[PDB]
Every structure is written in structure tokens, then in C-alpha cells.
Ligand binder design. Structure first.
Ligand SMILES: CC(=O)OCC[N+](C)(C)C
Ligand SMILES: CC(=O)OCC[N+](C)(C)C
Ligand SMILES: CC(=O)OCC[N+](C)(C)C
Ligand SMILES: CC(=O)OCC[N+](C)(C)C
Ligand SMILES: CC(=O)OCC[N+](C)(C)C
Lengths: 202, 202, 202, 202, 208
């Protein structure tokens, strides 16, 4: 098997509209944000503009192949793959993807999609100019799939590992927590990850 | 019947250009806005920038399947479905959809489409800085289908249920009213929902 | 014949690239603007930001069907139809279509496409803050079809749909037809000239 | 041959990717700018915002038809045609096409594509507020085709279509042809240099 | 073979989704930036707005043809070609491509893709108003391909050769360096080119 064959097969038979549930267990989706930059902060309106690297991981066994004498991995356009419908509940602008939209697929079926994203958020910006800093919370969850179809789980490296040293801001701490919430509109629980960003103006 | 089959059938046969009228009764569309955030208000120009959750519900029996030993629901890209052509009569910017464009389809034919939307509106903003607050009205209706083809109806959860606690504004009250209007441009009646948002600066 | 059949036939055969001329007479296209809002006015740069409903009407007999025991009308995506290539000669931004892109087709072949449009124009804004107001002229014509292929012709109240929350008010609207030859092309080109007399509200 | 047949044939034998060279002579492309408006000028940053009408003309003999008892001309979507890859070397924003994207094709093979374009340019703006005015130069050439494949050649009162409501007035427009060798490639690339002499009005 | 045939063949069979590796050696991609303009500089926020030509070059032997009595080269829409997934690590806006999206393909398989791009970057802008100027660094690498699949390499030239004389800024120097980096996220190494742009505001060089 070579890369041409593997990509042909994926394109011909991958089902980007079909959630790859196994045994009607939920698809486990790992999510972790690495912050790259904080661009604009407005303490009056409580809005922040952020660039982040959104690492997303899940299994789709329908993508698997025998890698004995073959590539162990390929890069695939996400339009050819099922991708989880993650949304940030407190976003106030659409996500602007800055990077090429390619996922990495491993022969066992694991998929890694790590786009870089610029997006505005509404959150608590008070204290950004103090020693304690502000604590901004971002909630990311599946938009239409409940906990029995998709479960999200937080995953690492330094919080500033990839954070720009030229930002006006600095990261004090990042914590990631998981939630399961029921909403009035729907019978089922929905999972989300809540990322807490503690940051301040230098 | 598995998801893959259900989604294959819907893609092969749903017809997204055809309004699913039964027995030439109008398609009943339920609409209700849940406000998430009020971002920019300009009392001088009478313009408001709003984020809201537009819950939309209707029946398309052509999507139905026998759910014995089958999923009761699937998520479907809205490009594969008929979707009502709702428009806000007093919008002054195009709707910016913030979330993944997926509708949820139930085996009986019920469709639930609930996008999160950012949009600018022209409305009465006077009094936003008083105790009584301002009352902004948004009219949403089918753009090209008259009352014999589509009827819109509001549906009744608390008003601030999903409203951001970090907005500069707070919601005092939300009411939803139904209208049937004839215009000079056309002979038939057009139904709309009028949502009244009473809000003020905190 | 039901909606599904009518829409299937139109999709299969309608020819969106072909101007529906009959007997080599020009296609008669009716155009009338209904102003909805005036958003930004700059008396210094002579630029105005307008929202308007663009009523456009013409006949395409190739879309006709026998409406005995059939719907008299359907809504059709404009990508399935021939649509006139109208352009505003004094626009300085591309038209932002705010509404669903659907035309209404009658069984006799009449088409009604009426999008809502936000667009910036360069015109005479002087006097906007006086009793007489400013008079802004917008010229709309076929971009590439001359008077033997397409003729445009203007076709109730002025402030009928004009927002009561605008900073501006409409004093008068007149619609005039022109036939112009340019230095570049030997042929003549029809346009409608819409004159908007408006001023700042007290 | 009616218009439907001509357009069917063009669409079916669409090679919009193939430059229509004959006998390995270069395709001769005529270009001339008609300025419509100058919107924003910044003497500090040396940036100008311009609206102009780009008249472009060339032969594609593969589009020809016998026009005996047939239309002499048709309008064709440019996605069905080969179009020259012209770029403005000193542009600092992407071209915003304001008008319908249709070319006019004559039965002999001549093509006429004249879009209206809003674009920002970096050029010499100094002296814009003097009697002599500023002289801004725009260079337009084929981006990837050298002089043996495409030749560009320049070809009416300078302000014939210039808006009388601009803050600026045109003193003079000259068009010059160039043939340049770059460090990147051994071959010469042709361009037209348009010189716009303009000043702030009084 | 004429142009029509060559373009038909490339369209029908070229697999824009398949990296053209030979012998499982990495695809060698050459990258060099030619700066055209620096538009907005903010010393407070450390952001710069740049226009540049991204010259990109690589071999795809699956595009080759026998050029006896045939064109030696064609222009091809990049949607019909494999193109390297380069990204600027310190970009803060998406690249705005200003030019037609066409690559030039030579009969031997060599591809040259040279788009003009406007993009905002986060980098060190301090000293932009001094004689020494600022030194802004831009790192460009393959986003998802590691060093065994894609290697990037910088291409002596004139730095200001295409730089606008009407910019508020002037280029003092440009250097291009190659890196190979391992990240905590992933076991393999990723190559990038680091381009160092030394520039300053005009006016900051007087002797009189
Ligand atoms: C169909 C749909 O949008 O369900 C919404 C679930 N929630 C509340 C997580 C967004
Ligand atoms: C075809 C069409 O746009 O009809 C308009 C109906 N209305 C007034 C609800 C928008
Ligand atoms: C092909 C073409 O654009 O002709 C232009 C006609 N005019 C002057 C009405 C725009
Ligand atoms: C392939 C390519 O972009 O060649 C560039 C020619 N030039 C310098 C006219 C833009
Ligand atoms: C799949 C993927 O995005 O890998 C990331 C490699 N890196 C760190 C160069 C961006």
C-alpha cells in the first residue's frame, strides 16, 4: 500500500457525514487548547481576541489500514473525514482558521486535527491589569451530539509553551475541566470542556 | 438500520429544494429565540448587535424511517435538507452563523435546527440607560412563502437562561407574538414572529 | 404535477446561462427599489450606506407549466434560473445580500426575485442636514446586455417599508428610465435612475 | 444557431484552463483602465483606494461560430472561459469585483471582459493637495505568462466615467507598455503602466 | 502534445491530495520571501502587516511529460496540483492571497508557486524608529508533514529588489535560516525556514 492508494480509499469510502460510533458507545474526543496569542482585550465590553491551537483527537476505525509494508500515517483534507462539530459556547465571532485544513490519520484509525484559530470571546476580563490577572473561561462542546454519541475530555506542556513572547499579555495559568450539562431544550446531557485562562497585561 | 444507511438514504433522496407540505396544509414552523449576548448598542443610530440561538422546528415526513433496532436520531448537514427561508425583516447585516450547520432529525420526521447567530438590527434603543430599559423588536418570517405554505409560531425556560452574565446588558423581559401581514407588493398573507426584547445597561 | 415535479423539471432544464428572449425582442425587466434603511452618511466623502429591497420581475416562458390541479407558484433557488445581470453604476462596495436567495416563479413564466441588499454608494450627500435634504441618485442597469436584449423599466408609498428608527427620513423617491450610449460600445444600454430625497431627523 | 445552442457549445467545449495561443504567437491582450472614483487617499502611508473599470480584450478563436442567421454576440460567465491572469504589481488588497462576472463574446472569437474593481494600491501620493497633484502609477501584467505567451498593450476623455462627487479630480491619465526581466525567471514579462495624475478638489 | 493535452492530462491524473515523495525520501521544498511592502507597524502591540512574494519550488515527477515538439512549461490552477501545506507559525491573521492562484509547471516536473500575500504577524517591532531598526522574524514550515516527508530550505540576492519605494519603511537586511524542531506534542521533527527582516522607519538616518 502506498500513500496514493491509502488516500484514494479514504476519499472513496470515508463517510464525512457519519459519526464513527463503535458498539453505540460514544466517540471519545480529546480536546486541549494551546494559547498562541492574546491580541485585543476590552475590559469595558468584556471581550477578548485570542489565537489558539486547538488539538483534537479521536478514533475512526473505518479509516484504518494494514500498515505492514505501508506508510503509518497520511495527511488528509478534513472535507474527506468525519470531524466533530465542536463549538465554543461563548464565542461572539466565527472561528477564523489560520492554517491548512488537514488532519493527520494513523493506520490504526486515530485522527489528529490541530487547526490554529483566531476568535473573539465574551468572558470576564476584569482584573487584567492587576497582579492576579483576569480569568477568562471558554466552553467548548459538541453542538448537536449528546453525551452518549460524543464525549469530550481534556488531555501536557507549559501553558506558555507556544505562547508568543511579544504579546502585551502573559499567561499565569491554564486549567481544563470537563462538564456534563442538561439544557431545557433537550432530554439528553451534553459534554463540554471548560478551559480557564488566567492572564494579565505585562 | 444503522446511521450510515439512514444518512445515505437522506442524502440520496431528501430533496432540499422542496417544501414538505402535507395534503396542501402549510408546514408549521416553530421559532423561538434565546438571547445569548447583546454586544453593541448605539442609541444615536438605533442599532443593536445581538447573539442569539434561533430554535427552529418543523416536520418533514419524507425524512422518516422505521426506528426499530435503529437510531432514533441523526445529525444531518443542512445542505441535505429542506430548511425554511426565515429572514429578520429589520436586520441590517447578514446573519453570521457561529456554529456548525447541522440539523437534528428524528425518526418520525421532526427536524430541529438551532444555529447560533450574530446579527445587527435596526430597532428602538431609546431608554437603554434607564430603569425601564429599551424595547427592541425583531420580526422573523418566511421570506418567499405565504401563510398557506408556511406558518410560523412561537414556542415557550427562563429568559436569561442562556444569556451571558458578562454582557454590559441585562434582560428584563422577552415576549413572542405572532403576526399575519399582507403587503402592497403581493396578494397573499405572510406570517411572522415578533420577538420583543426588553433590556437595559447594567 | 406537484411541487417536487415542477422543481425537478426546472432544475433539469431551466438554463441559467441563457437570456430568455422571445422573437428577438428584448427581455422586459421591471425594477423598483424600496428603501428600508439609511445607515451611514458621510457628507465629506459623499458616501452613503443603504439597505433596500430590490424588486425585480421578468418573464421566462421556458419555466411555464400547466397549472391545472397543480401549484400556481414555486420558490426556486436563483442558481437554477436565469437572472438579469443588474449592476448599480455608482456602487463602491459589492452588494451584500441579506436574505435567502430564492425567486418566486409563477406557472405562466413570471419570475419575482426580491432580495434585500446592503450597499455603499457614491453620490451627492450635500444638504442632508437641511430642510430640503440631500438628493442621492442610484443608477441600475444591465451590465453586459444592451437595449435590444434587455430593457429595464421602473414599476405604493415611499416610506412604506422604511425603518422608523433610522436617523434619516425619506422626503421623496422618484424613478426615471434612461438609454445611454458609452464611448466604449456602439450599442445603447438601459438603466433606471432612482432619486432618493432624504434628510437628517430632528 | 440560437443563444441556447451557442452557450451550450461554449460550456461543453470549455477549456477555461487553456491559453488560446495560435501558431505559438502570444495572445494579444488589450488593457485600459477607466477610473470611476478615488475614495481614500493617505499621504502619510502612500496608499490610495480606487474604483476602476478594467477593459480587457483578446481573441479566442476556439469560441468562434458561424453567425449567419445567428446572434452576433453572447454574454458568458467567465468561469466558462479562459481569462488572462492579470495582476496589479503594487496592489495591497485583493481586487473586489463590484459587477456581474460576465464576458461578452463575439462570433469571430473576440472576448470583452470589463469588470468594475475596487482596490487599494501603494503608490506616490505626495502632492495630492497641490496644483500639480500627485502622480500614482499602477502596473498591471500577466502574473505567470511571459511575453511569448501573453503580450499586454494599452489602448475617450480621462474623466469620462469619473464620478463628479469624488473629493478628487483627474488632471491626466497616461498608459505606457513595459517588458521586464525579473531575477526569478529568464524571460520577460509584459505590463501596462497606468499613470494617474490627480489632486484634491478645492 | 500541445498545451490543451498537457493540461487535460494533469487535470485527469495528478492527485492534489498526494505528497509526491520519491523513494520515501522527503520532498525538498525551496522557500524564499521577497518583501514588497510593510504597511502597518505597531510597536506597542508588536504586530506588523507585511506584503511579500512567497517563492515556492519543488519537484513532482508525476507531472512530467516529454517536451519534444511540445511546450516546455504550462500554468496550472493550484487546485489541480499537490501544494505544500506551509504555514507561518507567528501569523495572527489568515494569509490574504492577492494574485491569481496559478503555479508554473516545467516538463521535468518542477513546480514554481509564487503567490503575493498580505499577512499580519506577531514579532519584535522594538527599535523600528531607531538607526538599528527592528528585527522581525517569520517562521514558515510544513504544518502537518515532518522532516522525513517534507524538508524546507531557503534558496545571495538583493533584499530590497522588489520592495516598494513608497513604503514608510526601508529594509536594512534580510537573512534566511533553516531549523529542525521537535515539539512536545509530537515525536517527529519539523523543518522550517526562519526569515529575519531588519527594517526601520524612513527618516531615522539623517546626517545633516
Ligand atoms: C440540535 C441542537 O442544536 O442541540 C443543541 C445542544 N446544545 C445545547 C449543546 C447546543
Ligand atoms: C418573492 C418575495 O420576496 O416575496 C416577499 C414576501 N415578503 C414581503 C415577506 C418578503
Ligand atoms: C461587456 C460590458 O461590460 O459592456 C459594458 C456596458 N456598460 C457600459 C453598460 C457597462
Ligand atoms: C510563476 C510566477 O509567478 O512567475 C512570476 C512572474 N512575475 C514576476 C511577472 C510575477
Ligand atoms: C497534525 C499537526 O498539526 O501536527 C503539527 C505539527 N506542527 C507543530 C508543525 C504544527
Amino acid at each position: 500500500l502506498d500513500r496514493a492508494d491509502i488516500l484514494y480509499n479514504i476519499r472513496q469510502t470515508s463517510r464525512p457525514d457519519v459519526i464513527p460510533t463503535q458498539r453505540d458507545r460514544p466517540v471519545a474526543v480529546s480536546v486541549s487548547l494551546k494559547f498562541i496569542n492574546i491580541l485585543e482585550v476590552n475590559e469595558i465590553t468584556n471581550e477578548v481576541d485570542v489565537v489558539f491551537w486547538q488539538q483534537t483527537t479521536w478514533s475512526d476505525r473505518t479509516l484504518a489500514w494494514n500498515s505492514s509494508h505501508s506508510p503509518d500515517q497520511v495527511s488528509v483534507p478534513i472535507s474527506s473525514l468525519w470531524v466533530p462539530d465542536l463549538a465554543a459556547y461563548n464565542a461572539i465571532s466565527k472561528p477564523e482558521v489560520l492554517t491548512p485544513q488537514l488532519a493527520r490519520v494513523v493506520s490504526d484509525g486515530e485522527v489528529l486535527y490541530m487547526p490554529s484559530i483566531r476568535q473573539r470571546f465574551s468572558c470576564d476580563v476584569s482584573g487584567v491589569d492587576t497582579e492576579s490577572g483576569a480569568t477568562c473561561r471558554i466552553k467548548i462542546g459538541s453542538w448537536t451530539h449528546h453525551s452518549r454519541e460524543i464525549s469530550v475530555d481534556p488531555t501536557n506542556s507549559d501553558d506558555s509553551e507556544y505562547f508568543s513572547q511579544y504579546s502585551r499579555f502573559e499567561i499565569l495559568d491554564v486549567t481544563q475541566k470537563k462538564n456534563s450539562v442538561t439544557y431545557s431544550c433537550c432530554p439528553e446531557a451534553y459534554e463540554d470542556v471548560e478551559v480557564s485562562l488566567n492572564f494579565r497585561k505585562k
